[PDB]
Design a protein around this ligand. Structure first.
Ligand SMILES: [Mg+2]
Ligand SMILES: [Mg+2]
Ligand SMILES: [Mg+2]
Ligand SMILES: [Mg+2]
Lengths: 126, 210, 156, 97, 60, 92
RNA sequence: AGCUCGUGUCGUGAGAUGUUGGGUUAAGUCCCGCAACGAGCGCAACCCUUGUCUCAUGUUGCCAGCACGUUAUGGUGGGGACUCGUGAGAGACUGCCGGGGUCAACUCGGAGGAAGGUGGGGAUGACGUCAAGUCAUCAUGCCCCUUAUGUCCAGGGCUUCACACAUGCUACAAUGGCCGGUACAAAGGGCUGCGAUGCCGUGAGGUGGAGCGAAUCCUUUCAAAGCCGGUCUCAGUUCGGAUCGGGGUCUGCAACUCGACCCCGUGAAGUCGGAGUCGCUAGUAAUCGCAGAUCAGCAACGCUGCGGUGAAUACGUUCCCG
């Protein structure tokens, strides 16, 4: 069996792409029970929307860490890597949308003496 | 004078070692108390004798001291008059025995603390601080497996009132470079007018030490 | 970016149920500090109300309203030789669309109606019909630009 | 999740503890786990040194406390005893989550 | 601040009202912060040596 | 290659170097090449090459002419200044 | 990002060169030059965290393939091919091509690539100005007190108040309030501390123990914003919660002056705010909560770290300040 990995800010995911009926069985929860925002559904379908294979291939993912959007991005990256390893001809169809690479944008290290990252304390003139 | 951070205090867990390497639950307080007590007791003696580093370790209810003397013979005189005397003093001041074990250094000019002690003694002996620093730099750069040196004697130099801080350097003394293995020495000299600060830096070599 | 060059446009995918980059930009603008799904539902309800009211394509009506309220000239302020001049400069399509969306969302939040969905629906309807606060502000900006047209010869 | 949310006082100490744990468990011959990447945090220490007007040069000097974790599954009493018999460093203040 | 007074004040005192600091390092009854139970001198000594649990000074 | 901004103000060392190079070039006619240390021969070769590359004016005139044709006065600020301080005649 | 130094060169001398003219960046980083030659404090790198892959090993994590199980959980055997928190190696070095540029540094685009042109973020604070902060961390030259200004004790004060300034929280309402049902994050506080099931409680909580110098235990087999249903009908109100009265709780002998929390009633200002002004360039602002430093007991809405969901702009340096 083929298996890949997807990473995010503070989340990881491992999937095994196999043919069958389109479904997303998460760790104890289903697709609608894990993506209730209705935007993460579209986000994780985008890899399967550029190439119409939503109801053609299965997705049995196992993830850990992060939140809704993080898990959505991790599953998207995992599906992208699986499509890269299975159908190389469809690789550009997924790269054209901004996939196949983990966005370097992540949570940075907060600074000292400040309220948050890149935020100086407010002070009035005198 | 400047806001430069102590290289030893910064690399105490990267390059340099720690003078107190032990652990204890609720007894670290008494451990460091006995440590500073022994330090205060040996201050005058080992300063008149020449001291570089006092590494103290804690064992099962006993102590393990290692003092780095520069001039052996003053502290180690007659067997039963000076060494055993200080040992008994430490033992009766603390609540345990003391198996004192002295370790001799390889070169007094290579240790920063010893160079600072020597230059401070020279300054207190009513000599030219400039010439003293120059001769100390020469001794520490006479190929003692070194590559750079920087000596500074701040405070009321020459018994004056202005806080003159003569910045004297020789060779390569980088402070921002981590792979330096630079030894540092901080000393406080006491004169008839006030206090004086002595800051020394000895860049031995570019050894990784990983 | 600032003083370095332009920025790369985000290759955002078209909306799945509407397929309109303008609609997605309006959603991203009306988004309230993380209320993604809430803003999506609000815009969907507003478009559904506009459809029930008019009887045509919501995306086409929104595009028509945006094209009608698009400001073709925005005034500025530049000091040339120790004297402030409000010279009007040619605006770009992206900047004009962003300003139009900003004015639209502002006047929709300012409108006093029952719900935000109804507010946005009525704002879009007024912008499409040509009688709304957005159209009034567009006309005011056009009048200001025509009045300040006297000083436009630099193009620096 | 499990194993673990702990904290240590020295990076050297904690990495040596992890190494010796791995060594003793491998010598018992049981097993190992799959490490995963996770960074450390910056502890909360911004204490003053004097109650006087020291409000310039005031804030802090970070106390570096690096922490590492090692997950485990499928318990076995033999491994339990081999891991709970003794702790060589004893300075890593482990806390159960 | 001697051994006798330290031992008399650390354990159950005669009257409960006697609940002062009574540091263990120097022994002084007052001038010590119960935040750490140590007199400022040794407190800062350990802070600079890197032994007290989490105390430091200027870096900003 | 390199214009020396001292040929007309500090001609002492310039003339010394010129005489040394002339003596070396005249001795080269003898044939004393292998009768010298290798490092010294290499240092010689290098200095002679640098000279021959940076010297094309002092080997022909030797008569302090009264005319100069300069170019790129923007970067040759020292050259134009020296020309103006040693004589008004300058063609830039 | 500048500060400099040894020699040399010119001036009687203070001093001039090195640091003056260009290409380019963050650099006084490089080179062409340049009576200068080299070096130091500088910058970068060396160090830390994250991004891809590989090896030594498959732990009270995962369970894919096999099975044993009943729901409050991979709970129990067997499984490396799966995210390599311990060590190392590979991968960014303008590596190659083109337009270039003085065919010298250096700029843009392209191929592979996770990052392409110090990858994203920090540690890293030079000579020195503010006669900068500290003699209450400590030492400290000099003066002063000593039956005192040393020390303890009981009470009070630092928490007072007809006002002003500074920083944060609550909000001012429908992207809302209340009730019922629901999913993932990292970070641990624990030995005289954490403390799950139960008894009874509107609720702090009275009973208490399986379990802990470290995954059997709370902080849940992890929260809020987030999703579904009902209701309020857009108002000084089911928004907001303060003062105040009645019924109590956690600590310690002692809580109006002397913390916090719960139940009932009481229901004030606040309708997004003028003159002025602050912070923010991508995981940033915004918004939400979690945890900790010390305490037997908290003024903690503060200070530090954490991540959930996560936007619009970037003509340009004419212009306010450095
Ligand atoms: Mg002279
Ligand atoms: Mg100069
Ligand atoms: Mg003053
Ligand atoms: Mg109203």
């Amino acid at each position: 069996p083929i298996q890949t990995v997807g990473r995010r800010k503070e989340a990881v995911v491992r999937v095994r792409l196999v043919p069958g009926t389109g479904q997303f069985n998460l760790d104890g929860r289903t697709l609608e029970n894990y993506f209730p925002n209705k935007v993460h559904q579209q986000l994780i379908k985008a890899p399967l929307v550029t190439v119409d294979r939503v109801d053609q291939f299965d997705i049995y993912a196992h993830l850990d860490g992060g939140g809704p959007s993080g898990q959505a991005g991790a599953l998207r990256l995992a599906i992208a890597r699986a499509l890269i390893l299975v159908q190389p001809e469809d690789r550009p169809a997924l790269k054209k949308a901004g996939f196949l690479t983990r966005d370097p944008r992540a949570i940075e290290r907060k600074k000292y003496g400040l309220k948050k990252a890149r935020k100086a304390p407010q002070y009035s003139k005198r | 004078m400047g806001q430069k951070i102590n290289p030893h205090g910064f690399r105490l867990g990267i390059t340099t070692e720690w003078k107190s390497r032990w652990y204890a639950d609720k007894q670290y307080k008494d451990y460091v108390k006995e440590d500073v007590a022994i330090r205060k007791l040996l201050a005058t003696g080992l300063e008149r004798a020449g001291i570089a580093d006092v590494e103290i370790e804690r064992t099962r209810d006993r102590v393990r001291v290692d003092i780095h003397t520069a001039r052996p013979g003053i502290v180690i005189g007659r067997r039963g008059t000076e060494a055993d005397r200080i040992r008994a003093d430490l033992e009766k001041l603390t609540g345990k025995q003391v198996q004192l074990n002295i370790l001799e250094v390889k070169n007094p000019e290579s240790q920063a603390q010893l160079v600072a002690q020597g230059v401070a003694e020279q300054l207190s002996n009513r000599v030219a601080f400039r010439r003293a620093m120059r001769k100390a730099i020469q001794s520490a750069m006479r190929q003692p497996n070194v590559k750079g040196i920087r000596v500074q004697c701040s405070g009321r130099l020459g018994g004056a009132e202005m806080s003159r801080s003569e910045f004297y350097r020789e060779g390569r003394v980088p402070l921002h470079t981590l792979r330096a293995d630079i030894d540092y020495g901080l000393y406080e000299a006491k004169t008839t007018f006030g206090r004086i600060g002595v800051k020394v830096w000895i860049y031995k070599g570019d050894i990784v030490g990983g | 970016m600032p003083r370095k060059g332009p920025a790369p446009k985000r290759p955002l995918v078209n909306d799945p149920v509407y397929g309109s980059q303008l609609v997605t930009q309006l959603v991203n603008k009306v988004l309230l500090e993380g209320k993604k799904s809430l803003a999506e539902r609000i815009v969907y309800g507003a478009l559904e109300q506009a459809r029930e009211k008019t009887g045509t394509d919501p995306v086409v009506t929104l595009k028509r309203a945006l094209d009608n309220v698009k400001p073709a000239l925005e005034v500025r302020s530049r000091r040339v030789g120790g004297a402030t001049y409000q010279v009007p400069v040619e605006v770009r399509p992206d900047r004009s669309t962003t300003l139009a969306l900003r004015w639209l969302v502002n006047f929709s939040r300012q409108r006093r109606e029952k719900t935000m969905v109804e507010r946005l629906a009525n704002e879009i309807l007024d912008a499409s019909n040509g009688l709304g606060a957005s159209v009034k502000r567009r006309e005011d900006t056009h009048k200001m630009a025509e009045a300040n047209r006297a000083f436009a010869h630099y193009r620096w | 999740k499990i194993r673990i949310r702990l904290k240590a006082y020295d990076h050297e100490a904690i990495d040596a503890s992890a190494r010796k744990i791995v060594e003793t468990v491998t010598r018992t011959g049981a097993s190992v786990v799959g490490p995963v990447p996770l960074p450390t945090e910056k502890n909360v220490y911004c204490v003053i040194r004097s109650p006087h007007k020291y409000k310039d040069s005031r804030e802090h000097f970070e106390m570096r406390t690096h922490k590492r974790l090692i997950d485990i599954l499928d318990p076995t009493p033999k491994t339990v005893d081999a891991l709970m018999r003794i702790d060589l460093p004893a300075s890593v203040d482990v806390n159960i989550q | 601040a001697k051994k006798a007074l330290v031992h008399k004040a650390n354990k159950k005192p005669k009257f409960a009202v006697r609940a002062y600091t009574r540091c263990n390092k120097c022994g002084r009854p007052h001038s010590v912060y119960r935040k750490f139970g140590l007199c400022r001198i040794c407190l800062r000594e350990m802070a600079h040596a890197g032994e007290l649990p989490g105390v430091q000074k200027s870096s900003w | 290659q390199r214009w020396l901004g001292g040929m007309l103000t500090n001609f002492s060392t310039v003339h010394k170097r010129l005489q040394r190079l002339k003596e070396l070039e005249a001795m080269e006619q003898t044939g004393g090449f292998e009768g010298r240390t290798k490092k010294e021969i290499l240092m010689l070769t290098r200095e002679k090459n640098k000279l021959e590359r940076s010297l094309g004016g002092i080997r022909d005139m030797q008569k302090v002419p009264s005319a100069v044709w300069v170019v790129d006065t923007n970067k040759e600020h020292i050259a134009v200044g020296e020309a103006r301080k040693l004589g008004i005649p300058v063609i830039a």
